[PDB]
Each structure stands twice: as structure tokens, then as C-alpha cells.
Amino acid sequence: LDAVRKRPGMYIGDTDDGTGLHHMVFEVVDNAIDEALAGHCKEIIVTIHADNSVSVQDDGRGIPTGIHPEEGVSAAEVIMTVLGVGVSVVNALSQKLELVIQREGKIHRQIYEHGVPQAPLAVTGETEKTGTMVRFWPSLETFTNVTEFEYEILAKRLRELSFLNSGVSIRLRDKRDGKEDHFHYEGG
Amino acid sequence: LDAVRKRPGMYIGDTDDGTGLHHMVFEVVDNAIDEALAGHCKEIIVTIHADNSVSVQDDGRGIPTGIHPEEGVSAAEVIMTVLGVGVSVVNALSQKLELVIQREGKIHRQIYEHGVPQAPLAVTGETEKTGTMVRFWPSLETFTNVTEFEYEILAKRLRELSFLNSGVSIRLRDKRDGKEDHFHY
Numbered sequence A: 001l002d003a004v005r006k007r008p009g010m011y012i013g014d015t016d017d018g019t020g021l022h023h024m025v026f027e028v029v030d031n032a033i034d035e036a037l038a039g040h041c042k043e044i045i046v047t048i049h050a051d052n053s054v055s056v057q058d059d060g061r062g063i064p065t066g067i068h069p070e071e072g073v074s075a076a077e078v079i080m081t082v083l084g085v086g087v088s089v090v091n092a093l094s095q096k097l098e099l100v101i102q103r104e105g106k107i108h109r110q111i112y113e114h115g116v117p118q119a120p121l122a123v124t125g126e127t128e129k130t131g132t133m134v135r136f137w138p139s140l141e142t143f144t145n146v147t148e149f150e151y152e153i154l155a156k157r158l159r160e161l162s163f164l165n166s167g168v169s170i171r172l173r174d175k176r177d178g179k180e181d182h183f184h185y186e187g188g
Numbered sequence B: 001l002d003a004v005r006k007r008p009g010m011y012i013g014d015t016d017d018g019t020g021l022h023h024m025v026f027e028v029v030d031n032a033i034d035e036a037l038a039g040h041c042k043e044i045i046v047t048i049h050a051d052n053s054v055s056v057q058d059d060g061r062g063i064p065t066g067i068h069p070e071e072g073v074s075a076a077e078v079i080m081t082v083l084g085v086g087v088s089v090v091n092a093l094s095q096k097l098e099l100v101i102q103r104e105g106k107i108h109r110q111i112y113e114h115g116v117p118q119a120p121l122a123v124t125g126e127t128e129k130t131g132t133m134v135r136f137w138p139s140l141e142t143f144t145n146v147t148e149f150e151y152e153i154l155a156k157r158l159r160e161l162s163f164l165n166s167g168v169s170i171r172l173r174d175k176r177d178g179k180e181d182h183f184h185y
């Protein structure tokens, strides 16, 4: 991850005019869509929290959690820490990132700070559901000037995405003011 | 450096009881002593600053500054960012690290934050002096409980080092209270 830290702009885009900031969300959303597409119900929920973090969750199969035989850490951690640009860039540029994966009857949790895992991926409970949830707090050390998410920028993009990804239900919720939207297109 | 950030204790020592914290200084001092041995005057100065950062400097030749053929960045940056454990570990666990090198008639400076260079090593002026200086501010995200340097812990180890590195002069200064020592065997 140090290459990204060294020159963030080369990976996420402009870190001062808000474009890179929102790009962080879109990158996570792209992964979420992929996940949602591989399951039956296909629902993604994007939430703008009051503390200016954003969470993206999908009800897919859950990203893999088993230990990578070469890397020596869980697959999820490899996905988050190795290398659209990929969620690892997002992790790298986030002051905090919370990862929750529901898969095989188990809830797995992990926390990262500036892309550094605070502990290995851990099974903390049981669950009847499946899916992946990522919540991130953009690093204020990286993102300057524009540091708060604009609902409209997210809504417009999610709306466009919904038509391209038929069958995928996409919900947008803004806990700062209670605004909500639901983009769902059939087509196929 | 992510391996280091992930398990700091395994590289620098216990991050809660002061062990690791003081080890940071010792790692830098090892490099400094090596530089001093290679120079003419042979003196190093270790300063505990008021803000609980520590600087270590030598009057040696100055660490290499040219671009590393394989890494593509200055040799100094390679030293600070590529894996005693080495000063890259110290860099990794420091919220800030300032590097200054006086070599071949030029002054070179670079700043790091959590092991990340803020810019490439750069020539900032001319000088007749030679040597290297590194000042680091231990990350308080990593070091807990014991977060302030203890003069006696540093002094004890520096005294041991003075005997072992006989020709080298070692000064310890504490700016928090004016305390100082001079170890020279």
C-alpha cells in the first residue's frame, strides 16, 4: 500500500476538489455491485452516516474469508491490502475502515486504520444471512478542501448505475437529514 | 513497511511499557554510530526535545543521496523505507520523521509521516559541513502508556555504547530540563 500513500492522487484522483472523495464511494460500490450480481436477491445499501463516513453493503455471498495460502492472511485482508483501482486504494486512504462479512453461517469482522489491519479477520458470531459490508472514514490527512459527501453526487450516479445493472436494488440513505432514495430497474 | 505497522511490537519491542519507545532511539543511534566511525571527528549528539521527539545527529560523511538504480528513489529513501531491525522500522512507527543530510557540499532534506515520504529527498542549499540528522516523533497511535522518553534509559545504553565504540564521542542533551551527559571512552 505505500505506493498509494506516497501519491494518492495518482490512484484516486484529485484529493482537493471532491472528485477523489466521491470516487472512494464509487469504487466500493462497483465491488458491491459485483457481489450483488452473483446472488439472487441483489440488494445494495449505501449509507451516508452523520459522522461523514459511508457504508456500502450487499446481500451477496460474502467475500472469501479463508486464509490465502501464499499470503498467509485471510482472502478478505488480501483484497483490502494488496495493489477501477480496487478497494485497497480506498482502504489505504481511509483513516478507518470497518469490514463485516456474513458467510457460511458466520459473522467475520475486521478494522483497518490507514489500511493497516488492527487485528486479523475474526469470526465473532453466527448469522442466518450472507453479505459484505464496508464502512469507511476518508482520511482527512489526504482529502482536503472538500471533505463531506454530497448526496446528489451519489444519487445521480447510483441512478445511472441501476439501469446498467438490471435487477439490482440500490438504496441510498442519508442519516444526516433522513433523505432516502431507491433505484431499481428491471430490464431483463 | 505495512508488515511493520501491522505488528509493531514484533519489530521494535513492547509498545506499552516503554521498551519499544526507547528502542526507537537505539535503532537510530546504531546507524549514527556507524556513520561516526567512518568520519573524522566522530561525534554523535542525541537530543530529547521538549515535544518528546528525539533527534540523533552525526558529523560523518552523510548517508548516500544518489538515486538507487534498482529502487528508483534516493538511497536515503531506500534506507528509510525498505526493510537490529533498521531505521525504516523507526520511520514506520513515527508520526513524523525529519531527515537532513550534509554531503558533497549540499544540504538535503526530507520529511516522512508514518513512514511515507512527503516529497523526494531534495537539495535545499549549500554547506561545507558533512553529516546526517534524523529527528522523529513516535507515533502515539502506536506507543501507549509510556509515551515520554526517560533520560536514564537513554543514558544507560549510550554509556554502554561509548565503551564499545571507543573512539566515538556521544553527547546526550535533554531540552525538557537542561540535563546533559558526555560519554567518550
Ligand SMILES: Nc1nc2ccccc2[nH]1
Binding pocket: A005, A113, A114, A116, A141, B005, B113, B114, B116, B141
Ligand atoms: N494517522 C496516520 N496516518 C497514517 C498513514 C499511514 C499509516 C498509518 C497512519 N496513521
Ligand SMILES: O=[N+]([O-])c1ccc(O)cc1
Binding pocket: A028, A031, A032, A035, A056, A057, A058, A063, A079, A087, A132, A133, A134
Ligand atoms: O470488496 N469490497 O470492498 C466490497 C464488496 C462488497 C461490499 O458490499 C462492499 C465492499
Ligand SMILES: O=[N+]([O-])c1ccc(O)cc1
Binding pocket: B028, B031, B032, B033, B035, B056, B057, B058, B063, B079, B087, B132, B133, B134
Ligand atoms: O541512517 N540513519 O537513520 C541515521 C544515520 C545517521 C544519523 O546521525 C542518524 C540516523
